[PDB]
Design a protein around this ligand. Structure first.
Ligand SMILES: Nc1ncnc2c1ncn2[C@@H]1O[C@H](COP(=O)(O)OP(=O)(O)NP(=O)(O)O)[C@@H](O)[C@H]1O
Ligand SMILES: Nc1ncnc2c1ncn2[C@@H]1O[C@H](COP(=O)(O)OP(=O)(O)NP(=O)(O)O)[C@@H](O)[C@H]1O
Ligand SMILES: N[C@@H](CCC(=O)N[C@@H](CS)C(=O)O)C(=O)O
Ligand SMILES: N[C@@H](CCC(=O)N[C@@H](CS)C(=O)O)C(=O)O
Ligand SMILES: [Mg+2]
Ligand SMILES: [Mg+2]
Ligand SMILES: [Mg+2]
Ligand SMILES: [Mg+2]
Lengths: 481, 479
């Protein structure tokens, strides 16, 4: 775009975004939460092959079923996966081990029937791998807890649709075919899933609510608000926002039924939906771990419960790459095949046959991999030629704290513009396709399993006047081709 | 009354719902970073308004629309009292009215194309609920004929309060209000529908757009955006935002047809909708006055055009209080009576008989009035009136009107929220009713009620300062 065209387009974006709540709190918003900023976004949609997008959408229920079955297997105290997971958890005592200890505590006898239905609100993330001309969605990871952006996704998609249909991209007319402009309904669909869990809770017995368990001073609250509003306006269901402090201070469990209530209001909580509790810093003291256990012991349906959260571990992602292991959870030949083609090679770094080969590859051909820690979210992946130096810096026995993953090689989009805090950036971006999926299941049955929308997160990483390794992520949208 | 904790939670509920829904405004100096905005100043709860009063205000709007459409049509005629009255006002206020009048005269010159005679009045009638000796009656503060605000944010504050009620935020145990009594304005949609109607009239005379003429660095952009989005999503009509600089730099008129176009895009403008040009500071140089004349001479339908804007003067408001004058525009006895019931006494301060009566009253019983400058925060109230008048030459008192003071009851049970701070102060609430009327030199083609608004404000001397206070958007609970 010209200089003047870009500036007018930027103000069109800020204006539409603010009018529609496509927003996020800035750092230190605590000082004045009556103000918010436009969420970081691209100005144009990013091209994604229609074949790739359709494949991602179609396989989501298969992934939902797979992770539900894995969770169910983990839920059997006498199973091999239960032992396997305990072993992995004990290796990460500061986080995974604490989650595991809470889970063991839920196995103790209760005076009431326990809640066995759980809701998995998931997101499968992909990079479109391009090797020797073959284009194939490849899974980066599978998210099983507190997945973000279902609400803002709907809004960035509608922002770009608007700019196209309202002749803002070009005053003479649309520059895109609206039939190729993806418009996610992920906000509505996640709310529908939460309502489904409420339906399940009621069927086991009243105007129960959904308790949103949130991070203290959460900056991404407007993304979450879309779900709170949809639950009320579309599903007539109320909700509350509770931090771990609020859980400890305001909730109680009825000893005879296990039902969860807000003390001074008598509101009954049907579903505990987590938007916090996925990284060590989310638990600021032993009291927060106690709060999580309290919620997990109650009769409310958790979204997700402890085991479902634990099923999304990098170790399990690695394990599933073995066709024999996969087949213990998905026996359908075609589903199994469909799943395997979205996987790249992933190796453990332990003393097993596979682990020894991973160690050999990590040192001999590091350029082809990314070393990823089993404890998630720390932003500590180690790439390519940097791998040997990192590994040599720690005892070989501790290499098991990581997995070695084949590097996915997507094409970069060189024709988009990123907007953040009224500043634009013309840099090449990598785009990660997210597909939401929600599955309601218990110890053995699966009651609802659906595709729940899409997301496209893009980011750039460059060294320029903005700094070395400058760059950040933003919400993008999809134009199919 | 909310406890500290309950109020603090309710305040965050409001901030969160407001930001998520665009119930927002730019703060001062937002120009430094327009990617950031604040929650609009709003009340936490709705304010009680008698159902009878609300219904009366809604039902009378089309009558006021017709009245001002007729006044505007009369003003076009050289021999009418109004035409003449306006001329005098153009001398008294040559810096503003005088300049608008001169532009109007300039539009009377011949053109080589057929001129556009349809105009769209997007009005708002504002009321205070007078309470004198147990007599409850809506009384008109003023009638606004140009660039009326808040139709978009009105919808949102009404929906904010409805949500707080239905989502058990006002009370965790259930709703505290009957939803049947909670007014939910559709003024954003209805103003957009009126603009679409003007577009329809423009097309009937031949994919044109609506040009929003806006103030440079407008802080109330989100209120306007509601209309832009509705025009597109509900009426498939595009629009652009243009300051007077943009009008001068980017638009041209086809000499043969008078049609208005954006130069390099070829977009055709069907309607010129003003959200600026109502006060002297909106015209920063002669170039802005020229930009206004350029738009007015074009074939686009103006909302409002020059004469329609001029019809909403305080002088005309004063003249209409005489039944004989009103009767020149409204012949229906019942419509006439309904209008008169909403008027308080209003006097000139010139040397006409009524004016000399006004002067007597202003000095003998000032406590019953408010002195208002004819040019549109300069009102002078009650006992402060004599001192103010004594300070200016009597011959210039004609620059004001003397209006009976409306005395509403204050709502002492609401909380005002702005920039995260709450204020628990009594407020006065002014009911606004929007109305849109499409008309030409003689016919009135569409005339509708277009929604509601409730603006509240407080004024106190306390820890926040002397005469501290500001206005905010409120909502209505009927009873
Ligand atoms: N195999 C891969 N090939 C190429 N890039 C990758 C690969 N794996 C991860 N990445 C990049 O690294 C980012 C973070 O890796 P990811 O597995 O999502 O991390 P995390 O530790 O799980 N944290 P979080 O996303 O916050 O839960 C991704 O979004 C990608 O940009
Ligand atoms: N007759 C009255 N009785 C009581 N209060 C009044 C009266 N007239 C005006 N006011 C108050 O004064 C405010 C401003 O007066 P108003 O006539 O609305 O102003 P203005 O000069 O037309 N400008 P604007 O509203 O910015 O276009 C009103 O909203 C009222 O609060
Ligand atoms: N707590 C935040 C952020 C949660 C988060 O980090 N989610 C990651 C991991 S699942 C995502 O990629 O969505 C929220 O609720 O939006
Ligand atoms: N320029 C601003 C403000 C216009 C304005 O001041 N409107 C007054 C006078 S009509 C109102 O009371 O609505 C906007 O367009 O929102
Ligand atoms: Mg990730
Ligand atoms: Mg992760
Ligand atoms: Mg006013
Ligand atoms: Mg006025």
């Amino acid at each position: 775009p010209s200089k003047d065209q870009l500036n007018e387009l930027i103000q069109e974006v800020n204006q539409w975004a603010i009018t529609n709540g496509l927003s996020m709190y800035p750092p230190k918003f605590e000082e004045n939460p009556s103000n918010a900023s436009v969420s970081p976004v691209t100005i144009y949609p990013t091209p994604i092959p229609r074949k790739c997008f359709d494949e991602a959408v179609q396989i989501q229920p298969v992934f939902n079923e797979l992770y539900a079955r894995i969770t169910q297997d983990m839920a059997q105290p006498d199973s091999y996966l239960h032992k396997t997971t305990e072993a992995l958890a004990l290796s990460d005592s500061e986080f995974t081990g604490k989650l595991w200890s809470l889970y063991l505590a839920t196995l103790k006898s209760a005076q009431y029937k326990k809640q066995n239905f759980r809701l998995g609100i998931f997101r499968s993330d992909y990079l479109i791998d391009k090797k020797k001309g073959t284009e194939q969605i490849k899974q980066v990871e599978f998210n099983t807890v507190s997945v973000s952006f279902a609400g803002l996704s709907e809004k960035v998609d509608r922002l770009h649709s608007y700019l196209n249909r309202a002749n803002k991209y070009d005053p003479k007319g649309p520059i895109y075919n609206d039939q190729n402009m993806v418009i996610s309904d992920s906000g509505y669909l996640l709310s529908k899933a939460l309502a489904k869990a409420v339906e399940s809770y009621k069927s086991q017995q009243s105007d129960p609510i959904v308790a949103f368990i949130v991070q203290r001073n959460e900056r991404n609250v407007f993304d979450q608000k879309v779900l709170e509003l949809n639950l009320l306006e579309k599903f007539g269901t109320k909700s509350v926002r509770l931090t771990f402090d609020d859980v400890n201070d305001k909730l109680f469990i009825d000893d005879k039924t296990g039902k969860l209530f807000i003390r001074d209001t008598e509101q009954e909580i049907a579903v505990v939906y987590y938007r916090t509790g996925y990284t060590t810093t989310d638990y600021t003291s032993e009291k927060d771990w106690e709060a999580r256990l309290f919620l997990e012991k109650s009769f409310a349906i958790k979204a997700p419960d402890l085991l479902t959260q634990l099923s999304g571990s990098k170790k399990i992602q690695q394990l599933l790459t073995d066709e024999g292991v996969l087949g213990k959870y998905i026996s359908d030949a075609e589903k199994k095949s469909s799943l395997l083609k979205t996987f790249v090679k992933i190796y453990p770094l332990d003393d097993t046959k596979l682990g020894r080969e991973g160690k050999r590859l990590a040192l001999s051909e590091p350029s082809k991999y990314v070393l990823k820690p089993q404890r998630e979210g720390g932003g500590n992946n180690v790439y390519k030629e940097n791998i040997p130096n990192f590994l040599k810096g720690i005892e070989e026995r501790h290499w098991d704290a990581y997995i070695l993953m084949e590097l996915i090689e997507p094409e970069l989009n060189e024709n988009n513009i990123i907007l953040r805090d009224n500043k634009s950036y013309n840099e090449p971006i990598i785009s990660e396709l997210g597909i939401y999926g929600c599955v309601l299941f218990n110890d053995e049955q699966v009651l609802s399993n659906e595709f729940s929308g899409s997301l496209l997160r893009s980011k750039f990483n460059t060294s320029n006047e903005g700094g070395v390794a400058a760059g950040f992520g933003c919400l993008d949208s999809i134009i199919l081709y």
